[PDB]
Design a protein around this motif. Structure first.
Motif, PDB file in Angstrom:
ATOM      1  N   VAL A  15      28.060-105.578 -41.835  1.00  0.00           N
ATOM      2  CA  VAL A  15      27.389-105.941 -40.608  1.00  0.00           C
ATOM      3  C   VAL A  15      27.757-107.346 -40.089  1.00  0.00           C
ATOM      4  O   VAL A  15      27.533-107.651 -38.921  1.00  0.00           O
ATOM      5  CB  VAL A  15      25.871-105.771 -40.800  1.00  0.00           C
ATOM      6  CG1 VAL A  15      25.118-106.499 -39.778  1.00  0.00           C
ATOM      7  CG2 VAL A  15      25.518-104.315 -40.686  1.00  0.00           C
ATOM      8  N   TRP A  16      28.361-108.185 -40.924  1.00  0.00           N
ATOM      9  CA  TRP A  16      28.726-109.526 -40.499  1.00  0.00           C
ATOM     10  C   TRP A  16      29.789-109.542 -39.407  1.00  0.00           C
ATOM     11  O   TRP A  16      30.678-108.695 -39.375  1.00  0.00           O
ATOM     12  CB  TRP A  16      29.208-110.371 -41.680  1.00  0.00           C
ATOM     13  CG  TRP A  16      29.735-111.743 -41.260  1.00  0.00           C
ATOM     14  CD1 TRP A  16      31.029-112.070 -40.913  1.00  0.00           C
ATOM     15  CD2 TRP A  16      28.975-112.958 -41.132  1.00  0.00           C
ATOM     16  NE1 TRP A  16      31.109-113.411 -40.585  1.00  0.00           N
ATOM     17  CE2 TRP A  16      29.864-113.973 -40.713  1.00  0.00           C
ATOM     18  CE3 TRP A  16      27.625-113.280 -41.336  1.00  0.00           C
ATOM     19  CZ2 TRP A  16      29.452-115.279 -40.500  1.00  0.00           C
ATOM     20  CZ3 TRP A  16      27.212-114.582 -41.126  1.00  0.00           C
ATOM     21  CH2 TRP A  16      28.126-115.570 -40.711  1.00  0.00           C
ATOM     22  N   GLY A  17      29.724-110.564 -38.555  1.00  0.00           N
ATOM     23  CA  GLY A  17      30.666-110.704 -37.466  1.00  0.00           C
ATOM     24  C   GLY A  17      30.698-112.160 -37.059  1.00  0.00           C
ATOM     25  O   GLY A  17      29.882-112.943 -37.546  1.00  0.00           O
ATOM     26  N   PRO A  18      31.594-112.547 -36.134  1.00  0.00           N
ATOM     27  CA  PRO A  18      31.764-113.924 -35.640  1.00  0.00           C
ATOM     28  C   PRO A  18      30.845-114.469 -34.567  1.00  0.00           C
ATOM     29  O   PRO A  18      30.443-115.629 -34.624  1.00  0.00           O
ATOM     30  CB  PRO A  18      33.207-113.930 -35.162  1.00  0.00           C
ATOM     31  CG  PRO A  18      33.354-112.550 -34.613  1.00  0.00           C
ATOM     32  CD  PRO A  18      32.678-111.674 -35.642  1.00  0.00           C
ATOM     33  N   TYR A  78      23.156-102.921 -51.049  1.00  0.00           N
ATOM     34  CA  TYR A  78      22.554-103.812 -50.092  1.00  0.00           C
ATOM     35  C   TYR A  78      23.664-104.802 -49.726  1.00  0.00           C
ATOM     36  O   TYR A  78      23.991-104.969 -48.565  1.00  0.00           O
ATOM     37  CB  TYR A  78      21.408-104.563 -50.736  1.00  0.00           C
ATOM     38  CG  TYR A  78      20.996-105.761 -49.942  1.00  0.00           C
ATOM     39  CD1 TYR A  78      20.057-105.651 -48.926  1.00  0.00           C
ATOM     40  CD2 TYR A  78      21.575-107.007 -50.179  1.00  0.00           C
ATOM     41  CE1 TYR A  78      19.711-106.745 -48.159  1.00  0.00           C
ATOM     42  CE2 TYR A  78      21.237-108.103 -49.423  1.00  0.00           C
ATOM     43  CZ  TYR A  78      20.311-107.966 -48.411  1.00  0.00           C
ATOM     44  OH  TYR A  78      20.015-109.042 -47.613  1.00  0.00           O
ATOM     45  N   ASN A  79      24.285-105.402 -50.734  1.00  0.00           N
ATOM     46  CA  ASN A  79      25.364-106.366 -50.504  1.00  0.00           C
ATOM     47  C   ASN A  79      26.566-105.822 -49.793  1.00  0.00           C
ATOM     48  O   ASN A  79      27.365-106.586 -49.277  1.00  0.00           O
ATOM     49  CB  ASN A  79      25.847-106.996 -51.804  1.00  0.00           C
ATOM     50  CG  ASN A  79      24.857-107.972 -52.367  1.00  0.00           C
ATOM     51  OD1 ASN A  79      23.943-108.413 -51.681  1.00  0.00           O
ATOM     52  ND2 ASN A  79      25.012-108.299 -53.629  1.00  0.00           N
ATOM     53  N   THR A  80      26.755-104.514 -49.812  1.00  0.00           N
ATOM     54  CA  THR A  80      27.911-103.949 -49.132  1.00  0.00           C
ATOM     55  C   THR A  80      27.645-103.699 -47.650  1.00  0.00           C
ATOM     56  O   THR A  80      28.505-103.950 -46.819  1.00  0.00           O
ATOM     57  CB  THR A  80      28.411-102.712 -49.838  1.00  0.00           C
ATOM     58  OG1 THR A  80      29.066-103.133 -51.036  1.00  0.00           O
ATOM     59  CG2 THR A  80      29.392-101.907 -48.970  1.00  0.00           C
ATOM     60  N   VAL A 111      24.679 -96.484 -48.048  1.00  0.00           N
ATOM     61  CA  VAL A 111      23.846 -97.506 -47.412  1.00  0.00           C
ATOM     62  C   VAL A 111      22.628 -97.007 -46.638  1.00  0.00           C
ATOM     63  O   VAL A 111      21.525 -97.434 -46.941  1.00  0.00           O
ATOM     64  CB  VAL A 111      24.648 -98.558 -46.605  1.00  0.00           C
ATOM     65  CG1 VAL A 111      23.712 -99.652 -46.128  1.00  0.00           C
ATOM     66  CG2 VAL A 111      25.766 -99.170 -47.469  1.00  0.00           C
ATOM     67  N   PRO A 112      22.790 -96.088 -45.654  1.00  0.00           N
ATOM     68  CA  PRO A 112      21.616 -95.585 -44.898  1.00  0.00           C
ATOM     69  C   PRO A 112      20.562 -94.800 -45.732  1.00  0.00           C
ATOM     70  O   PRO A 112      19.369 -94.744 -45.374  1.00  0.00           O
ATOM     71  CB  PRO A 112      22.246 -94.721 -43.797  1.00  0.00           C
ATOM     72  CG  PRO A 112      23.606 -94.351 -44.331  1.00  0.00           C
ATOM     73  CD  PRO A 112      24.050 -95.588 -45.064  1.00  0.00           C
ATOM     74  N   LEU A 113      20.994 -94.212 -46.849  1.00  0.00           N
ATOM     75  CA  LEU A 113      20.080 -93.497 -47.738  1.00  0.00           C
ATOM     76  C   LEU A 113      19.301 -94.474 -48.622  1.00  0.00           C
ATOM     77  O   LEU A 113      18.198 -94.170 -49.087  1.00  0.00           O
ATOM     78  CB  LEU A 113      20.852 -92.506 -48.615  1.00  0.00           C
ATOM     79  CG  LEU A 113      21.179 -91.185 -47.906  1.00  0.00           C
ATOM     80  CD1 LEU A 113      22.386 -90.500 -48.475  1.00  0.00           C
ATOM     81  CD2 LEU A 113      19.962 -90.287 -47.933  1.00  0.00           C
ATOM     82  N   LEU A 114      19.841 -95.680 -48.749  1.00  0.00           N
ATOM     83  CA  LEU A 114      19.282 -96.741 -49.580  1.00  0.00           C
ATOM     84  C   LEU A 114      17.783 -96.987 -49.694  1.00  0.00           C
ATOM     85  O   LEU A 114      17.311 -97.258 -50.789  1.00  0.00           O
ATOM     86  CB  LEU A 114      19.998 -98.046 -49.288  1.00  0.00           C
ATOM     87  CG  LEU A 114      19.853 -99.178 -50.291  1.00  0.00           C
ATOM     88  CD1 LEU A 114      20.394 -98.794 -51.672  1.00  0.00           C
ATOM     89  CD2 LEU A 114      20.631-100.318 -49.694  1.00  0.00           C
TER      90      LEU A 114
END
Length: 577
Positions: free
Chosen positions: A186-189, A179-181, A123-126
């Motif tokens: 990162v999602w949260g409540p 990107y989708n991963t 992800v961060p290398l994306l």
């Protein structure tokens, strides 16, 4: 300049100068690759590391930056050789150099790439992977076009074009999968999570997805000449919530659900803002928007009132002028309180001001101030694509819609947090078809949908959302303005996916124009990936009879229950064979 400022200008280049040539080649040197030092690369990595909260392990992190410097020096060698060759394309020396440099460039890319996709740090290398992958498709596209004139044998040139084809797709899929991963990681409540989630989506659209969408244009046999895309996706900002010291627990779902659902593209005409009061504090309580169909091919409609219409002060009228609203200077108001609340003295999380500025290339336009300015500038999160002209002229997006988030029923405070929607500058107000270019027109820029057509969420690589239909019928209808002489003959292609074979029919001004059989591209119940789509043309060319025409598209000859997805149609000049 940040990874976001570079990326935005690259996207501008890729949308206006997409034609094989030296200019394209040197273009990539002036924007990205003509740099010396880890500095910029370290900046690209940090931008995502500090967002998903994942610093890449040291060794891998250095190795990645090192390869980037390697690819940088080499491409600089390559680009210069190409510039010289194109000038004296017959000089056998220059022609052998190019074959020498090309090979090295290609093999460096084939090796650097996996090191930009290290296990656990994908992800961060994306954004750094997307920059290399873009370079690679660009050089593969280079031999594919000028390989013969460099002295390569048809067999290698053919294998290069086959690599270009396999990769355009492999790269696209990798970027969208990762990107989708991250996005879901990162999602949260609570609301604090939503701000992080949306920020990831925002920045990664600007620096990853917007580039990926253009990968398809590297297919040289399909886009021989200057091809022009339009990005129709929308990115969001929420001043009140992104600048809040705290976090409203469990409010994430509510915030997302408030974002406008997939829809055809519309142009904002006006916003009428309403002011209320509480404890000596006026604030933006609600508003009502009016928008037109693309090209103003339909009449101006109005959305229901968002929020509540307060009386504390008279309504303010924000009406579009110039090229649109390119900037908002918001003023959030956080009235906090040390408890004791009967329903009367309440906390306020709202906005008490916003200055709206209108874009123009010619003159300096008067902004429209709602109460007072603020310090939360949209430019700091959605910067100009061109920093050599005033922001009013170099702006990259323009406002499209303003929602209004409010506190749940039963909440004891007053929340008035409007989410702002931003549209890429490329999605032009009008659908213009000129000569000497393969004009792409996504179907979301349609004036209207046919009965049963749905605007479904895009897969990630199309630059916006896509239409869908599960039975024979009319897909949509669009107004088109031809600037090219009517004498010009055109041909139409349709990028689409389908679990079935079917026919696509087109008609201009009620008159049937093209019809043909297109085959399936995927099994029922398959998840869309670049391979699911095909871009197919009609063989018979045509002329437009008038400057403004209504083009309609329909699908037939298939059982209901099948999924048919249509992304865009392309107007290709007939001389392009």
């Amino acid at each position: 300049y940040t990874p976001i400022d570079i990326s935005l200008s690259l996207t501008q280049f890729l949308l206006s100068e997409f034609v094989p040539g030296a200019g394209f080649v040197l273009g990539l040197v002036d924007i990205i690759w003509g740099i010396f030092g880890p500095s910029q690369w370290d900046a690209f990595l940090v931008q995502i590391e500090q967002l998903i909260n994942q610093r890449i392990e040291e060794f891998a992190r250095n190795q990645a930056i090192s390869r980037l410097e390697g690819l940088s020096n080499l491409y600089q060698i390559y680009a210069e050789s190409f510039r010289e060759w194109e000038a004296d394309p017959t000089n056998p020396a220059l022609r052998e150099e190019m074959r020498i440099q090309f090979n090295d460039m290609n093999s460096a890319l084939t090796t650097a790439i996996p090191l930009l996709a290290v296990q656990n740090y994908q992800v961060p290398l994306l954004s750094v992977y997307v920059q290399a992958a873009n370079l690679h498709l660009s050089v593969l596209r280079d031999v594919s076009v000028f390989g013969q004139r460099w002295g390569f044998d048809a067999a290698t040139i053919n294998s290069r074009y086959n690599d270009l084809t396999r990769l355009i797709g492999n790269y696209t899929d990798y970027a969208v999968r990762w990107y989708n991963t991250g996005l879901e990681r990162v999602w949260g409540p609570d609301s604090r999570d939503w701000v992080r989630y949306n920020q990831f989506r925002r920045e990664l659209t600007l620096t990853v997805l917007d580039i990926v969408a253009l990968f398809s244009n590297y297919d040289s046999r399909r886009y021989p000449i200057r091809t022009v895309s339009q990005l129709t996706r929308e990115i969001y900002t929420n001043p009140v919530l992104e600048n809040f010291d705290g976090s409203f627990r469990g409010m994430a779902q509510r915030i997302e659900q408030n974002i406008r659902q997939p829809h055809l593209m519309d142009i904002l005409n006006s916003i009428t803002i309403y002011t209320d009061v509480h404890r000596g504090f006026n604030y933006w309580s609600g508003h009502q928007i009016t928008a037109s169909p693309v090209g103003f091919s339909g009449p101006e409609f109005a959305f229901p009132l968002f929020g509540n219409a307060g009386n504390a002060a008279p309504p303010v009228l924000v009406s579009l002028t110039g090229l649109g609203i390119f900037r908002t200077l918001s003023s959030p108001l956080y009235r906090r309180i040390i408890l004791g609340s009967g329903p009367n003295n309440q906390e306020l999380f709202v906005l008490d001001g916003t200055e709206f500025s209108f874009a123009s290339l010619t003159t300096n336009l008067p902004s429209t101030i709602y109460r007072q300015r603020g310090t939360v500038d949209s430019l700091d999160v959605i910067p100009p694509q061109d920093n050599s002209v005033p922001p009013r002229a170099g702006f990259s997006h323009r406002l499209s819609h303003v929602t209004m988030l409010s506190q749940a029923a039963g909440a004891v405070y007053t929340l008035r947090a409007p989410t702002f929607s931003w549209q890429h500058r490329s999605a032009e107000f009008n659908n213009i078809i000129p000569s000497s270019q393969i004009t792409q027109i996504p179907l979301t820029k349609s004036t209207n949908l046919g009965s049963g057509t749905s605007v479904v969420k895009g897969p990630g690589f199309t630059g916006g959302d896509i239409l869908r239909r599960t039975s024979p019928g009319q897909i949509s209808t669009l107004r088109v303005n031809i600037t090219a002489p009517l004498s010009q003959r055109y041909r139409v292609r349709i990028r689409y996916a389908s679990t079935t074979n079917l026919q696509f029919h087109t008609s201009i001004d009620g008159r049937p124009i093209n019809q043909g059989n297109f085959s399936a591209t995927m099994s029922s119940g398959s998840n869309l990936q670049s391979g699911s789509f095909r871009t197919v043309g009609f063989t018979t060319p045509f002329n437009f009879s008038n400057g403004s025409s209504v083009f309609t598209l329909s699908a037939h000859v298939f059982n209901s229950g099948n999924e048919v997805y249509i992304d865009r149609i392309e107007f290709v000049p007939a001389e392009v064979t």
